[PDB]
From Swiss-Prot:
Shown part of the complete sequence: 12 to 532 of 5037
Organism whose genome encodes this protein: Oryctolagus cuniculus
Compartment annotation: Sarcoplasmic reticulum membrane
All residue ranges annotated as the MIR domain in the record: 75-126, 133-174, 180-231, 237-296, 298-347
Subunit comment: Homotetramer. Can also form heterotetramers with RYR2. Identified in a complex composed of RYR1, PDE4D, PKA, FKBP1A and protein phosphatase 1 (PP1). Repeated very high-level exercise decreases interaction with PDE4D and protein phosphatase 1 (PP1). Interacts with CALM; CALM with bound calcium inhibits the RYR1 channel activity. Interacts with S100A1. Interacts with FKBP1A; this stabilizes the closed conformation of the channel. Interacts with CACNA1S; interaction with CACNA1S is important for activation of the RYR1 channel. Interacts with CACNB1.
Protein name per the record: Ryanodine receptor 1
Amino acid sequence: QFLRTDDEVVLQCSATVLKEQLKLCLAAEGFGNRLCFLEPTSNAQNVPPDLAICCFTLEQSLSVRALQEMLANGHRTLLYGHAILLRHAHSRMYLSCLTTSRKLAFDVGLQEDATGEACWWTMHPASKQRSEGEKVRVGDDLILVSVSSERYLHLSTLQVDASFMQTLWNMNPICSCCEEGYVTGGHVLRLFHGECLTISAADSDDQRRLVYYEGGAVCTHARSLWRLEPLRISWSGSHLRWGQPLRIRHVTTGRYLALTEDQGLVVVDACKAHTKATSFCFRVSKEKLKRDVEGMGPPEIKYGESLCFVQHVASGLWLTYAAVLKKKAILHQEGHMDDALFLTRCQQEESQAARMIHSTAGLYNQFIKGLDSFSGKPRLPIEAVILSLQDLIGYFEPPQSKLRSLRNRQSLFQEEGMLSLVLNCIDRLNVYTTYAGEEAAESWKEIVNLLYELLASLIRG
């Protein structure tokens, strides 16, 4: 019904493209790139969208008198006329109106701290059906106005900016108060057998596509982290239910647990992750065996205490095993009597790290791919690579058991091959003594210096 501070939301707008509605959500990575963009969510049945970086938390909802009061120095329902502070779940930065552009438009993206007016947004009713001081209702079209620049949060042409043109937004709830201890969608977690479900380590002959039960240290590495993704956008953070279908996304690689005709149980690119290949559910038992709600729903599955059998929804097949303990994970008609898994929730530091490794690997791989492109040939995400490097250098800065996080964060990245990755950039740039752009070459010495600085920061201590 209503929205409250601390609810988690997405900011959705629509565009009409090829005479069909396309729904899109405000997204940003934060590290490596502060700028918002739009993540299409309409084709979810075929291609699951990247939702982790669309989630925002309603930190704060103030009257403007209450805002001006604070600027010159609790599950509150949101009222029209209030100013809101939206913290990005992944990066923990705040949604702001930036002071850069590309005329009258400002960039929208993420600000590293909630000081000043740029990260505040007033909410206005999009019809006479709502008035200042009334509660914002889940479902309401609304207008969002930057407190700092007085422009409207705006969809352009698909991009987002702050503009004098209005755009209608739906602030759609992802979740509200959940029952302590209960599994919800959007959680990052591990699945333990009796040893946990994972894909192999970086640079494996695997190509990282096969699934395993493995024990030992993997139980604390990023490669065994998974994100649960119900087949819905709104209330995708609701409590999970026995038999409810969901996709299971591998965090550091972005691939989706799947049944595949040629190869059996594997992990699959998002573009191949259609519903049937990719829907599993949790079952109480292997016996033969509703209508999805518009709230948190009944809590059903508990971290630690619940035993769960994972079933592939379209085939009915059971997640099981085949054969420094490492077993291959398979889908089978019968499985084994000890197939039930238990779930353990990841904590935020490690969860964040795993997403950062995903983006970083993507970015530097693309940057390596551009270098290979003109390697043989006399005649690149320079901006992002630089910011990414600068961001990681700050993240790895030495400090007071901050030394523990550091060592552990360094460890997560190292076990995901970030050292080779950084080394590969250095080796490829050092093929040159002093091809690319001349524009590109303006940034060469800066980037190699930043890489070496990162390298050192990944080993220090």
